[PDB]
Design a protein around this ligand. Sequence first.
Ligand SMILES: [Ca+2]
Ligand SMILES: [Ca+2]
Ligand SMILES: [Ca+2]
Ligand SMILES: [Ca+2]
Length: 130
Amino acid sequence: GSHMYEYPVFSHVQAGMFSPELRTFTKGDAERWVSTTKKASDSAFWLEVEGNSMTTPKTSFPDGMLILVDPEQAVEPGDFCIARLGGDEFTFAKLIRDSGQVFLQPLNPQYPMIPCNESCSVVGKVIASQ
Ligand SMILES: [Ca+2]
Ligand SMILES: [Ca+2]
Ligand SMILES: [Ca+2]
Ligand SMILES: [Ca+2]
């Protein structure tokens, strides 16, 4: 007699003009809720992938896919995550170790890898998709 879960879907828009991979949360409550078997913290939420920066040329997050983000789970190289850059804008990428260096790597080679040091902090771990 297990249980299923449903988390809020949060909206976000392109942060800049020529950087679609950079997002910003929109003002407003959640209007949509998506279910999953994935047990997560009460801070967890979904984000709709909008674009192809995470679409591979076999893990791949095509445009339109929903991803479950849990701010309460620890992230390490190898995990996919949401990272805040600058303090207000965020991006969805794989956290990796490039020759010992920590970078955010989009799955679509067309987008640049970004260092995660000072103006970079992890928002949450991606733990599921729909
Ligand atoms: Ca909590
Ligand atoms: Ca779309
Ligand atoms: Ca570990
Ligand atoms: Ca899935």
